[PDB]
Amino acid sequence: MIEIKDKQLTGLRFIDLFAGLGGFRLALESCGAECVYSNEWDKYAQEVYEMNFGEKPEGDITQVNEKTIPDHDILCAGFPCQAFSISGKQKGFEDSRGTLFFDIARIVREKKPKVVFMENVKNFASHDNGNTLEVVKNTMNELDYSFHAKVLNALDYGIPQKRERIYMICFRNDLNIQNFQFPKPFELNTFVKDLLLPDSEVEHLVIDRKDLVMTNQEIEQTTPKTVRLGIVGKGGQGERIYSTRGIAITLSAYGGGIFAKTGGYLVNGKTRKLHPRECARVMGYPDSYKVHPSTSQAYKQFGNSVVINVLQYIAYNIGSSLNFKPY
DNA sequence: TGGGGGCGCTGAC
DNA sequence: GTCAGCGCCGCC
Ligand SMILES: Nc1ncnc2c1ncn2[C@@H]1O[C@H](CSCC[C@H](N)C(=O)O)[C@@H](O)[C@H]1O
């Protein structure tokens, strides 16, 4: 994550729904905002959240009375994506994990925050012939909010990961915000190899599979894209190897394959998956952030998370818009 | 709400 | 056909 000198969100309160690791919290707090409520039902996510912020998020949001949620200015929510991801079954709203947005709408209707800031996977934007996004849009408009949605790739914002996500920023209409803008892309000068840990700290992650098939030569020039170098097995998810001179593939939460949830990389002649700390860095998390003691849970948590830097630029722009109140 | 890994299909070229 | 995906499923 980056440093934010001008705290655009100072004095603003926000809630951290579907908190996970608290990526939205790091992002908004870096801009000066104050978190007044967090919600996350996963036992392990609650533990790591507590390790880093000192509070245990409240459980199952579908059972929380929206009237008991503290007043706030910005509602943050990177809601479940299994039901919308290109990697899943795409049952969408028909999925038990796909109706969480309506819980968000329920809370918004009641608390009417100034801003609603949501995130989901790229496929969310085209799911069900675009009907899914339209539904979110119409729901927000009905609740009297504007709707700004755009898919941003983390590689365009200083982080070496091809993580494409749709970000939805909504302003309550009475605020008449007409100048919100998604941050503009800039050249990437950081690649996977710049975030790796020393070899001595990741030796245990080195795997030597005799079914390894190198399909492309390593590149010596850094490039802002994923560069596949080979595969193991049939080359399915988690069985693909990439160059560290390129960018990281999208980290996942329930992913499988021998290089589960991070993908494999060629590092100093050997092939290995990423270490949880490297996952943190590829997600823009500061080294000061404490990862969960269970590596499997840590991989899952970062795989479900958000790239801090991207949210920071967006949060900064939300604040910039809110602060422009000329006479 | 465990931890590991083989998979197989979809979306967007 | 190319290829990558906050995933799925069954195993222990
Ligand atoms: N009913 C529910 N109540 C509370 N949390 C829920 C929930 N259903 C799913 N979740 C939580 O929703 C999260 C979605 S992933 C979002 C992660 C978050 N942006 C962070 O930065 O990491 C998961 O952690 C999941 O456990």
XYZ file of C-alpha atoms (C1' of nucleotides) in Angstrom, chain B residues 1-12:
12
model
C -15.451 -22.491 9.428
C -9.680 -28.582 8.344
C -5.702 -29.281 4.539
C -4.116 -31.158 -0.232
C -4.693 -31.362 -5.053
C -6.816 -33.055 -9.733
C -10.070 -31.105 -12.387
C -13.023 -29.183 -16.326
C -15.681 -25.844 -17.964
C -16.697 -20.748 -19.022
C -15.594 -16.233 -20.738
C -13.031 -13.455 -23.687
